Each structure stands twice: as C-alpha cells, then as structure tokens.
Scaffold this active site. Structure first.
Site, PDB file in Angstrom:
ATOM      1  N   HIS A 124      -7.299 -14.939  11.805  1.00  0.00           N
ATOM      2  CA  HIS A 124      -6.200 -14.033  11.583  1.00  0.00           C
ATOM      3  C   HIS A 124      -6.646 -12.570  11.551  1.00  0.00           C
ATOM      4  CE1 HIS A 124      -2.246 -12.644  10.815  1.00  0.00           C
ATOM      5  NE2 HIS A 124      -1.755 -13.839  10.539  1.00  0.00           N
ATOM      6  N   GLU A 154      -1.529 -14.951  16.973  1.00  0.00           N
ATOM      7  CA  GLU A 154      -1.121 -13.834  17.825  1.00  0.00           C
ATOM      8  C   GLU A 154      -2.159 -13.250  18.751  1.00  0.00           C
ATOM      9  OE1 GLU A 154       0.975 -10.998  15.515  1.00  0.00           O
ATOM     10  OE2 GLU A 154       2.618 -12.400  15.127  1.00  0.00           O
ATOM     11  N   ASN A 180       5.569 -17.177  16.639  1.00  0.00           N
ATOM     12  CA  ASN A 180       5.910 -16.084  15.718  1.00  0.00           C
ATOM     13  C   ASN A 180       7.004 -15.253  16.366  1.00  0.00           C
ATOM     14  OD1 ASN A 180       3.833 -17.039  14.226  1.00  0.00           O
ATOM     15  ND2 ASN A 180       2.604 -15.165  14.279  1.00  0.00           N
ATOM     16  N   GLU A 183       5.980 -18.056  11.864  1.00  0.00           N
ATOM     17  CA  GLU A 183       6.342 -16.766  11.274  1.00  0.00           C
ATOM     18  C   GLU A 183       7.722 -16.297  11.710  1.00  0.00           C
ATOM     19  OE1 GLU A 183       3.748 -13.452  11.812  1.00  0.00           O
ATOM     20  OE2 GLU A 183       1.968 -14.609  11.340  1.00  0.00           O
TER      21      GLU A 183
HETATM   22  O1  LIG Z   1       0.850 -11.440  13.402  1.00  0.00           O
HETATM   23  C1  LIG Z   1       1.622 -11.659  12.301  1.00  0.00           C
HETATM   24  O2  LIG Z   1       2.587 -10.883  12.654  1.00  0.00           O
HETATM   25  C2  LIG Z   1       1.003 -10.954  11.322  1.00  0.00           C
HETATM   26  O3  LIG Z   1       0.280 -12.043  10.890  1.00  0.00           O
HETATM   27  C3  LIG Z   1       1.681 -10.374  10.200  1.00  0.00           C
HETATM   28  O4  LIG Z   1       0.633 -10.115   9.300  1.00  0.00           O
HETATM   29  C4  LIG Z   1       2.514  -9.183  10.594  1.00  0.00           C
HETATM   30  O5  LIG Z   1       2.258  -8.027   9.798  1.00  0.00           O
HETATM   31  C5  LIG Z   1       3.916  -9.553  10.297  1.00  0.00           C
HETATM   32  O6  LIG Z   1       4.334 -10.420  11.397  1.00  0.00           O
HETATM   33  C6  LIG Z   1       4.872  -8.427  10.268  1.00  0.00           C
HETATM   34  O7  LIG Z   1       5.215  -7.980  11.548  1.00  0.00           O
END
Ligand SMILES: O=C(O)[C@H](O)[C@@H](O)[C@H](O)[C@H](O)CO
Ligand SMILES: O=C(O)[C@H](O)[C@@H](O)[C@H](O)[C@H](O)CO
Ligand SMILES: O=C(O)[C@H](O)[C@@H](O)[C@H](O)[C@H](O)CO
Ligand SMILES: O=C(O)[C@H](O)[C@@H](O)[C@H](O)[C@H](O)CO
Lengths: 447, 447, 447, 447
Positions: D120, D165, D293, D351
């Site tokens: 992450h 991501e 996400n 997410e």
């Molecule tokens: O990639 C994910 O997005 C991240 O893990 C989060 O930590 C972002 O900050 C959240 O999605 C807000 O946009």
C-alpha cells in the site's frame, strides 16, 4: 390545585422484555415472533430490532439504582418466554430463570415490589411455526411457562399479570398485521383472542392450585371513543371501538360471555369464536384485579369504509404527542367509570405515558410536554379515587426510552433518556418531577 | 378530516367600540363608565385606557379594507352610546351618528353585512351618576338610544343585538367589581340584570313597532362547567355556574321566569329580583336569534368558600392561553346542545377567540396557537350543524388586538396585530389561515 | 468550464395563466375545469386555488419590468381560454382579448418576444359539462379559440404552441385523477389524448390557411427512464414510461401512427383509440418545432403492481428537490438525442426548473440549489448543441412562484419570490445569476 | 425501496498502514518513500506527515472494538513493508511481524476476517535509493516480503491483495509527481507499472507453491469517463482515461497483453514497456478475485493540451464532496459491467467513500452527506448483484479519518472521527447508519 393520593397508593414505572433487554441470542434465548418480525424488511421502521435495545439484560443494576432514586414502590416488567423455554414447548433454561432472579432479588433488596407480566408478546417462534396462538397446543405451552414462573418465583413476586394488551396480541397482530406475527385474517385474530383467554383462565387456576404468592390479573389496553354526532350509528361505531379492546376480553372473564353485538358483527363477516365446551367456565376464573393501559381518546363516527369495525376517528384539531396521539385525559376518567359495569374491581393503571422525543441538550432533557401529559392524567386518577373507584396504582409507561414496536427507537416514551449509541442513561426532567410526586404522594397543578 | 360548512354560513370577526375607537373626547362624545373606570388608579392593568385604543374612529377605512381582503361576510361592532347621546338621556349628537354612517356605508359598499351590538358596556357616566342600570329611568334612556339607531340605520343594518354579555354587565361589574362600574353588591347586580332584561324586551318591541330591517337578539356569554366528582353537590355547583351566565337571562326571555333554584340561592343571601307587574311579559318579547360568546370550559366542585356561587374551578393541568384560560373546545358542543332546552333557536357564535401574545418577528406574527384554538372550535361548530342545530355563523373574537378591559393592551386576541405605538396593522398568520377557511367555506384538520 | 451559447440562442422564462393571473371572475372570465377542481375539497393541497394567485392579471406591468431587467429575449405564457370564450363554445369576450393585448404590446415594447401557449389546461367548465375533451365537439370549440387568437394577434406573436403537456392533460388528469378534471378511466384518457391531437392538427392547418405570423408547434412534457437491471422486461417497462409521454403524441404527429406496442398494451386493458378516417392525416400536419418540458429522470423496473404501465421507479438515494424529484440532468441530454428519431427538428426547452422553497431572509432568497440545478441542465443544453442538435432556446420554469396545481402555493419554482400575502415580488439569487448567463450568453461552472 | 443483499455478502471497512499507524520510527521500522515525501517541504499539504497519524500502532485494540461493534465481517488493512524488512532487501524484523500478529489475532478473536493488502505504497526508502520499482531487483525484494507474510500468517489470513491501486503507484507517483516518490517521467512510470505486475505474478506463484490459506488478487483503482460529445475523439479520450487505470493492469493479468492502443499512444511519446521474455507469462498467473476502488466518475472530451492522455474532464456543475469530487454513483454500475470483459470474475469493492469534513458538534458528527453518498453507491452494488455479477463484498473507505496522502489530515474520509490532537475516536452518524445496514444485511432508501 393540590391532589393528595391515598397512603398506600402504588407508584411505579413499566417496561417489557423485548423492548429493553439487550441480548437476544445470549444465554440460550430462543427467537420470538418479534425477533422474526423485526428481522423482516418493511415490518419495523428503519429495520430497527430488539437485538440490543437498552441492553437491560446487562444494565439492570444501573436501571434499578435509577428507579430506587426515583422513590418508586413497584416495577412492572415482563418475562421473556423464549429465555425460559427457548422452544416454547420444551426443556427449561435455568440461565433464563437466573436472569430474572438477579433482577427480582435486586428489586426486592431495594424495597421495590416486582409486578410481573408473564406475556408481553414474545411468543417463541417454534410455537408460531406450529400455528402460534391459533393452535390450542400453545395454551398448554403457556400454562407450563406460567407454572414454572409461579413455582420459581413463589415468594419473590406478589403481583402477576397473565397477558398484556389482548387486543394488540389478537387484532393488531392478526387482523391488522401491524405487530408480530403480522397476519391479516379476522378468524385467526378471533382464534388468538379466544385461546389467550383460555390460557389466562388455566394459568389463574394453576396460580390458585399451587398456592402462589400475591394477586393475579390481566392487563388489557383500554380504548375510549365518543361519537361525533348524536346518531345511533355513530353511537354504535363507538361501542364497537370501545368494546373490542376491553369488553371483548373482560366480559368472558367477568360475565362468562363475549359481547353479543360484536359476536353478531363478526358473524356478519363470516368469523365465529371457536368456543369448546367449558371454555367459558375456564375463562371465568376469578381474578384479583386488572391492569388498565391508557394513552388516548378519540371522537368517532360510523363509516362503512373505516376498517373492520366501520368506525372512523375524526381529527378534531387537538394537539398531539410526537407519535401523533391527541392528549385528552378525560378519557381515562370515562373508561374507569365505564369499567364499573364489572363491579368496583381493583384497577392498576399499568401503563400511561406519552411519546415526547426531546433529546439531551445542556446535559438535560427538557421534556415539559411529558410532565404536562402525566400531570393531566394523574389528576384523572385522583378524580376516580375521589369518586370511590378502587384504582390502586399507576405505572408510568416507560422507565426508559426503548424499542417501540414497529416504530423502532424513533419514538421515545421514557422518563429516562437512553442514547442507543452509548447506552448512557440520562434521567429526564419528568423523572425528577415524578420523583417529587411519588415521594410526596400528592400532586399540585399550578399556573 | 374535511369539514364542509353550509352554503350560507355567515363568517365574520368582531370588535366593541370602547376597545378599538380612538377618540374618546372627539366630536362631542361624552364619557362612559369605562372611561371613568380606566381613569381610576388600580382598576385596569398598568393604568391603560381606551383614550386612543387602535384609533379605529379614524382608521376604520383601513380596517374595513383588511376585513374585505379577509373574505368575511359580516362584521360585528358595537355603537358607543355616549357618542349618540353624550348624556345618555338627552339631545342627539349627529356627529356620533355620522361616524357610524361612514362605517356602515363602507361595510355595505364592500358587501360586508353589519352586525350591530347596541350595548357593549359603555353606559354614559351621566346615567351612572343617577344610579346607572340600578335605576329604571336608565331603561327609558336605553329605549330612546335603541329607537334612534333603529330609525337612523333602518335599511343599512339587518342584524342587531341589544346587549352583549349580560352576565359581565351585571355580575362581573356589580357583584365582583372587576368591570365598570366596579361595584360589589349582589342586590345591585340583580337589579342591573333585571333592568337590562326589561330594556331588552322594550327595545325588541320598538324594533317590531317601527318595522325596522332585519333580525334582533341578545348575545350572552356562555359558561360551561363539568363536575369533578359524581356528587349531587358538585353537580349543583356546576348548574349554578352554567345557569347564571345563560339561563338567568334566557329563561325570562324564552320561558317567562328566572331559574328558581338561583332565585332561591340569592334569596338565601338576602337578595330578591325587583320584578314589577308585566316586567316578565315585556322580557318575554319574541326574539329572532341569540349570539353566543364562548371561550373556555371548566371542571368545578362545590366549595362553600368559593365565592357567591360556592363553585370552585379545578386546575386540571390543561394547557392555557396567554390570559390563562384552558382550551377545551368540547365545551362549545356541550352548551349548544344544552341551549336546545329553549328550542332549536337560531344561534350565532358572536365571539370565540384566544389570547395569544405573539408579536411581529421577521415581518409576521406566527400565532400558530390561535390557528390551533380556532381550528378546534370550528370543528365543534361543524359538529353541531351536523347534529341539526341551527348555528348560523361564527365571528372570531377580534379583528384587531385591542384594549382588553382590565387587562389593558397586555392581552392580545386579534387576528390582526396592532402596534399601539404606531397604530400599524399587521395581519397575523391566523388571518391568512382564516381567509382560506372563510373563502373556501370548508376546514381541514391535518397531522 | 466555460460553455459558450449560439449567438441567436433564445433565453426566456415561462408561466401559465391559471397559475399566475389573479382575477378568476374578473372581466367576464368564465370558470375552467381547474377553478372547479381547486374548489373541490381534497383535490388541491390546503384547498388552495387560483382565485388570486400572483394577481398577474393586474401586476403584469411589474412582472414585465422585472423580466426586462433580467435580460431575457422571450416570455412564454398561456392564454386563458375562458377569458376569450367564457363558455368555450360561444360569443367572444373582447375584454379577455384586451388583457392579452396589454400584455403582448408591453412585451413587444420591451423587445421581449411573446411565446404563446394556447392551451395550458384551463378548459372552460361548460365544455367539460358536455364531455370535455372526450367529446369531439370540443375539438371544434378549440379550433375557434385558436383562430381567434391567430387573427387577433397576427403580427404581434411569432411563436405559438397549441398544447402544453398532452400527457398531463390526458393521462394524469383522466387516468390518474391527479389534475383537472380528475377522472380515472383509461379509455377517456385515450379519448382525450386523441381528440387533443386532432384539435392540434386542425389548429396548425388554420394557422397555415390564415397566413398567421411565426412558427407553431406543440410542447409535450418529456419522460426519461433507465432500467434497473439489464432484463428485457425492465427495458420494456422503461420504453412504456418514455413512450407514453412523448412518442404517444409525437409519433402520430411525425410518423402518422401511435406506438404500436402501447396500442397493444392498452388493448390488453380493453381500451382502443377512437380513430376516425383522416384523423391520422389531420394529426400529421407539418409543425415548425416542438417545445420540450424536462425536470427529472428515473431508474425503473418492471412491476405488475406498478400502475397501468407496470413500471416501478426505484429510489436510488439521489438528492431531491423540495417537491421530491431527484436531480439528474443527463436525462435531458438523453431525451434530446432520443427524439432525433423524428429528425433533427427544432426544439425549445419550454420548461426546466426546480422546486426550491427558500424564502426571503435578510432581504434576499438564497436559492443556491436552484442555481445548481439550472447550471447542470444548461450544461446539457450546450452539450446537445455541441452535438449538432437544433436546440433553439431555454425557458426557466417560472418567472414567479405560483399556484403549483394540486401542490397549491406550497411548492415554489420561481426565480422571483412572491409573498402571496402582499403580492410583493423579490428576485431570488438565481434571478441575478440567470441575468448574467442570459446577458453574457455563456455559462461557467467553477469549483 | 428496499435492497436485500446476499446472505454471504462481505461487509467491511478499510485502512492503509502509513495512513493510520502512528509510530514511524518505533520497533525498528525503516523509512518508506512516503516518510521521505511527507518530510519534504511542498509535497504534502501543511507539511503534514504520517509520523503519528491516528496512532493505530498503539490504539488498534480500541479500533478493533469499534469495528466489532459496527457488526462488520472483514477488515482491510495494509502491511508496512519497512516494518518487516527495514531495508526492503534484508534481515526480517520480528518486532514488525509481532505487531501484525497482535492485530490479526485480535481480529480473528472477534470474528472479523482479515483482508490483507501487502503493498500500500510504503516502499522502503533503501530500495528507492537503488531505483525503487524502476529496478527489477525490487521485484525480488517484494517476493521475499510476500513470502514472509504468506508463511508467517498462513492460517490467520484468508484474503490477500498484492497491490493497491497500481495506477496511483505508477502514473500518479512517477509521471504526475503527486505521490511518492514524486517523479515526472513517463518511461519510469511505465517501468514501475510493469515491474509491479511482474512482482504481482511471482507473488501469486509463491502463494500457490507455498499452499498458503485463502484467495489472492490485486486491487486497482477504477476510472470511469463518459464522452461530452458523440465524437470519435472524445470517445477515444475516455477509452484512454478508463483503460490506463484498469485495462493497463488487468489485460496483462487476464489476457496476456497490454492495451495495444495505449502501447501505441505511449510509443508516440517515446516510451516503451520493458517487457522481457516470459514476463507476460508470469503476469498472467491466475488470480482468485480483484478488489475495485471506486470514488467518482467524469465526463471527458479530447483536448491536446489536457495532459499526457489528452483527455479533459468537464465540470458539469454536479455537487462535489469536500475534496472536490462530484458524486455520480452510476459510474460504479458502469465499470462493474465494463469489467465483465474479463469474465464474471469475483469482485470486492475494496474501497468506496467520500471526503466529508464534518466535525464533532454536540458530541456527534452529523455526516449526512456521507450517508447519502454511501447509500447511492450501495444501491449500485445491489443493482450489479441483481444483474448476476459476482460482486462479493464492500469495504467503506476508512474506518477512521486519517493521513490523506498529499492532502494531509485536512480531508476526512472516515466513518469514525479522529481528533488528531487527542487521538479521541468519535463514531460518526454514518457509522451507526452503516452498522444497521451491515447488521440487517439490507438497505432502504426513503424520501
Ligand atoms: O488508494 C486508495 O485510494 C488510498 O488507499 C486511499 O488511502 C486514498 O487516500 C483514499 O482512496 C481517498 O481518495
Ligand atoms: O402493551 C404495551 O402497550 C406495550 O407493551 C408497550 O411496549 C408499547 O410500546 C407502549 O404501549 C407504547 O405504545
Ligand atoms: O363581551 C365580550 O366579552 C367582550 O366583548 C370582549 O370584548 C371580551 O374582552 C373578550 O371576550 C375577551 O375577554
Ligand atoms: O406542465 C408544466 O409542468 C406545468 O405547466 C407547470 O405549471 C408545472 O407545475 C411545473 O412544470 C412544475 O412541475
């Protein structure tokens, strides 16, 4: 005006198991028709349920301390049937009995007289699966439940009620579908009403045979309607409304028969009471007193489209509580006098309160409207006592804000605010007002 | 609920001369017992008086425009006796007559039917000096006054009332000393009540003899009391309370006699009615209708220390208006049915309203409580009509906030707010609500 | 993002006669089915009616000054049929024509192009008594009305619309009973829809035969539904929803036939279109453009219990306006592209707005949500123009807060606030925002 | 509308190590590229950093109690690589492993299924010094890290994600310079993307070879763009926008190749993917599911000046969250259906949330807008399930307000408010709302 109450007037508050105990699967508790109902989408507001509700299964010590500080003499609560007999018909759950022993002993340790409601709507799901109250076998299961409690709590409880609100259990639940089990069939509603009356009669018999401590009665919710016009039809519409709530259950108990005009009415709709030989004799078992649940009063008129009783309630413009009920306390005075048709029997106002949704602001709950409501109704209570009626006590509906059936936690009736997010209790301004009334044993209305 | 009113139901508002006309010394007006009373320290709250009060003597055009926009069909107002006969007994003041001609013509020009109250408490001081209503010569002075108005306004006014609230004029003013002339003697109160009844009978005769336009009646304020207990004594206490306000004046009118039980009651207190031969026959002169003034209802009990009628009002805890009166509209339904003892006579609710002191905030007067009060009472009106009673119309007590006798300007009853510092009129939210009811001719209560 | 609009884009606002003109009985105006409907208890919220509504019959000069200051180029308004022909079928009322001449001349004097809607729901009651639009004779009455206006206003009006929202006139009023005349019969709804289409075709013919000035079209309210699932049935449910509002009226006009699938659907329900020989040819009369009324968009699914079209709208959780409609502007882009099935015809967004109930606070109406709504929809308008579609103009639904049919005055859609108690106009913040957009001829969205 | 979810639907919340763990130098943790980035002036708003951020390294027990009370079934969290291998490439830090054992055991003790995100964004600085993801040696370091976790947590974790991501890790961090390491070179972004894909494939292999517990996938952030006009160029611009976020990483995984059109696009810009023989075969390693996400959706148009993808986002005027993102949930429905190009694979919404900055007022956080946002997106989730897509669960983005990369603590996404001055947790109103949805397993949208 100063209203002095009798020396031995019994002051209290009331709750019901499923509305406040928070531990629906704990210690072997089985599911009730209400767990089932609340777990069904569309049956209860916001999908609320009694899974946690107040958590009184764990916080009873605190609640009891609060009611001890209230200066109250009695506490009405109900027993969760599926905690005692998780199947309804079956093997006893000692853990369930233990809970009530903890509660009852604490009450007694604090000089607070338990006022036990055996049945407060939480029929074990297992029995409902077999037909619930529509099946006479459920009568047997109930008598077993009653016996168990009578023997287990013999010298600890002196006030007992078999059923709470037979009208809601039968008609609201089986004809109107609003409460569990949520059916809409006149015949089954009539079956349920008759079977609970038989269960009641048998339970009183056992109470007497076992030589159990105290007195025993039943607590119907009372209805009161006044006609819009002086017409015979509006008058009849009001008789039906009034009689189905009380006379339908009290006439068999006190006079050995169901209200003929209502028997005829339902017959017109193709429903008949499933009366077996000696059922009426069993139902007529002498009782010590009755509990009366009163909240509102209405002005009705005959209307053929107005439901199964063809009785329409007129919106007279009167101010209403937060659940939408108009407040008119004279109705209490009226039914109490009306009930004298059964003799000057002992009556306890087992429930009376108002939905006032005020929250905690500045550390307090300024529920002036609940104080106002209670004040007006207590005047009526004094008034009936002054008229010579044997009204023995009063129990404020709800010590705590709770799970208010179908309305969920949205409608607050408590004298003690409960923040369902923290379980934190905050005695409302009505609590402190009530404390003074119950402790002084006299009320004063002032301008 | 939707409450549809009869096609020809007469909707209106009401005022009284001394409460709204602002020009107590203008155009030759003589002083009344009320100018005198209000000018005495300690008689009226804050030393307030009707010297200016609303200034409707000058602002009537504006008021009339406002009531025209209200959609109203009738306007009840009273005539200032000392403006017509500055001495009471004497030479006519054309200027005084001219004022009412300006008012009446404008009303008629606007399609608003004048509903004229001849006597609304402003007895010329000169007559009071000679004994006022305690002196039979005042009866003659009144008949002259009545005749003058009947002849002057013959085809312009179709609805006439001789006296407004005989109970207040006699008992409240001469026994309780609260209203002008402020005496406290039972016998004089009884003399006043009897003499005004004779004046009324004679005036109706003249009305008939002169062939004057319209109908004529009297407008008593109505009382309604319900007993606290079921005792014969509480029942009697309520009969006295109820009967002195209405039956004391209506029985002689409709049945040719005073309520015997009240005659006996007062006899016990050493007072007797000064009835001369043919007085009762004169009083029994047939009338076309009656006006009924209703505001509140009470629960009473017998109490030997509770005033001359030994009837104590119990504070039942009900919510009250800003002047302290509890609102309970059923009382209106009850008296209307009670009055049926005189036959199904024509009745106009000549006054009904509430003291709600809300002021202008954000350019409006959010008097929700007045809308609430009116709504509940209008339901009762519909209810009696639906029961077949001949209730012909309703007049909201007060078009404008005004000089509220003894209370001064402190107690607001108007549907139109009046800032007594600027004379600026601001129609309240109740005004707009009323406009819709009177214009649609149906009312709707909603949750 | 900056959105530049075409040089000759027509910016405007819109109203309808019965919603704003305040003088329902003035100058010989006859009653319409809407006066009747609003005068019936239970049909319109709070018993509100168009008796006074904005009083634009008298305040048009002010309104026109306000719209002139807005920088607007066109004003859409409707003509009250019962003001021109108080009986519908009858003798012309010059006074009614004079009113529109005053309005139209003032508009023209101010460089504001009148956009005239002949029919905006106010059918004379007299015609309704004879069957209204269910009777072909009403078609003749309408053509007479249309001719009168075409001849009277020949060179003063250049934009004409025969009917406004055929779906509401036919189905909402005759199948759903929500709008006047409030019937609930599929067959009559279909009859009404067909007869108004014939009336429309004939009126366009007369327009052409008389050589009247300008262009003429019809203004259907547009529906847009997207399916919940990818099922054929949900897809069909959406086609029905979409097609009944637009295709049901546009297919006969542009293609000479009713949507077969909807013909079959209604046939299943026992209703058939009363098509006479040459009716379809008359309906197919070439039109210059169409007006499109758009407010919301929905996500639907097939549901046999979901009304006559068995199309259920899903509450997707989207934020809603104060009347409860979700805002989703893409729907406008979608229907505009969908309508291309009739060719790249000239389209005017004759109505688009939001119910936002903000009131006057601190002398202004901070209706940010209406600015937000409009901004999103104007982006879609630009988007379609950029896609080559002939979208010629946009008219904000409502210059003024008005009588909102069935909702009464409770639901505000105006860019100018109207205090119905004083008739005082207060341009909202959206008015000033719109003034900048229409005057600059470009819009800018910013973060 | 009531939306019932599948019996085994997995409800959860999610966090990331560097955003919540507060002990950046504790227990031998080495520095990551994010510590470095945040410690550089100008890289993160207000110079905020993750030095303390929530202090979940110490307060995990509290957090876990809060999520247990939430009724949640899974908890997605990430592992801090530099806590396990302080150098990235090196000797294991048992203390780092111990922390996750404490966390994981507690989760498991509470019936909450761990959903572990290996990567992450916290790449050990030491590896970055050697070229970071631009250096194939980092792939080896990652596989070692993955193996360690697979062996250490074998039977304690059943759900694993290699990368979170990939688009942000590669393009946002190495092309746009917004996230660590903050570079702006297309070629290095492409190198990073390719190397992380190889690392992913190898790690899945090890997972399979080691016979580790559970399922394993990757969690790309999903993009969704709709064209402004119907032009081929706007359509292409949207394909580029959509494809770079998802297809760029999913096509090699599922189909064994990079999107050719994007390969050509980057080739035009002089960048080529450093594909070695068998890299594609390694990347194509079969995976069990993917995490998706999703936050927003856009309307784009081709614009040569609009960045490396020449795709401009239009500000459509839609309402935005506090971080400025427009809410339009349909985008979720759209991508889910779009992803079906890879088969009806198992998808978890790993997410989804909104930046709503409401603070504690009156002891609560009235985040109605977050409830609104979630409600709309959960409807779309139900919608896809109802369409037959294998969407297995949903994780609300953020249990807690946290260090929001580059935005600092300024942008709150949590359902539980964290006062960074006291570390005090305050569950928001959305928390209680979510608790009801996840516990009832059905959602209801109401007006
Ligand atoms: O990639 C994910 O997005 C991240 O893990 C989060 O930590 C972002 O900050 C959240 O999605 C807000 O946009
Ligand atoms: O039978 C009692 O009525 C019920 O037990 C209560 O639980 C109700 O909630 C209360 O009456 C208010 O409706
Ligand atoms: O006779 C009526 O009583 C009077 O006319 C009013 O002027 C009263 O003031 C009103 O009833 C409120 O007290
Ligand atoms: O058919 C048009 O819709 C009507 O002309 C309006 O008068 C509506 O009230 C308005 O669109 C609000 O919905």
């Amino acid at each position: 005006t100063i209203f002095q109450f009798p020396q031995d007037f019994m002051w209290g508050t009331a709750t019901a198991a499923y509305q406040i105990e928070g531990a629906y699967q704990e210690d072997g508790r089985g599911l009730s028709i209400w767990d089932t109902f609340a777990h069904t989408p569309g049956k209860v507001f916001n999908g609320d349920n009694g899974n946690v509700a107040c958590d009184s299964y764990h916080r009873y010590e605190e609640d009891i301390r609060l009611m001890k500080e209230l200066g109250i003499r009695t506490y009405r609560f109900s027993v969760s049937w599926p905690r005692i007999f998780p199947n309804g018909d079956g093997e006893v759950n000692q853990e369930g009995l233990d809970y009530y022993h903890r509660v009852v002993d604490l009450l007694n340790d604090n000089g607070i007289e338990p006022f036990c409601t055996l049945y407060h709507w939480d029929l074990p799901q297992a029995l409902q699966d077999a037909g619930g109250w529509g099946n006479r076998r459920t009568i047997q299961a109930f008598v077993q439940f009653a016996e168990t409690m009578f023997r287990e709590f013999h010298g600890k409880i002196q006030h007992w009620l078999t059923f709470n609100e037979p009208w809601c259990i039968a008609f609201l639940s089986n004809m109107l579908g609003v409460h569990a089990p949520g059916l809409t069939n006149l015949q089954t509603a009539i079956d349920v009403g008759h079977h609970l009356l038989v269960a009641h009669g048998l339970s009183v018999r056992r109470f007497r045979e076992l030589g159990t401590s105290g007195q025993i009665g039943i607590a119907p919710n009372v209805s009161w309607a006044v006609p819009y016009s002086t017409s015979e039809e509006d008058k009849a519409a009001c008789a039906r409304t009034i009689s189905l709530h009380s006379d339908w259950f009290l006439q068999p108990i006190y006079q050995g028969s169901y209200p003929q005009f209502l028997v005829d009415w339902f017959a017109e709709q193709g429903a008949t009471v499933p009366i077996q030989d000696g059922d009426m004799d069993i139902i007529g078992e002498p009782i010590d007193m009755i509990g009366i649940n009163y909240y509102s009063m209405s002005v009705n008129r005959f209307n053929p489209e107005a439901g199964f009783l063809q009785s329409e309630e007129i919106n007279m413009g009167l101010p209403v509580t937060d659940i939408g009920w108009p407040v008119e306390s004279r109705g209490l005075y009226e039914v109490l006098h009306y009930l004298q048709k059964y003799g000057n029997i002992d009556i306890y106002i087992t429930e009376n309160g108002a939905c006032i949704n005020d929250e905690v602001v500045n550390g307090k709950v300024q529920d002036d409207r609940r104080i106002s409501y209670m004040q007006q109704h207590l005047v009526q209570v004094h008034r009936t006592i002054h008229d010579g009626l044997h009204v023995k006590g009063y129990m404020a509906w709800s010590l705590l804000d709770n799970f208010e059936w179908a309305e969920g936690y949205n409608m607050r009736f408590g004298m003690i605010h409960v923040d369902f997010r923290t379980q934190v209790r905050t005695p409302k301004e009505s609590y402190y007002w009530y404390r003074n009334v119950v402790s002084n044993n006299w009320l004063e209305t002032r301008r």
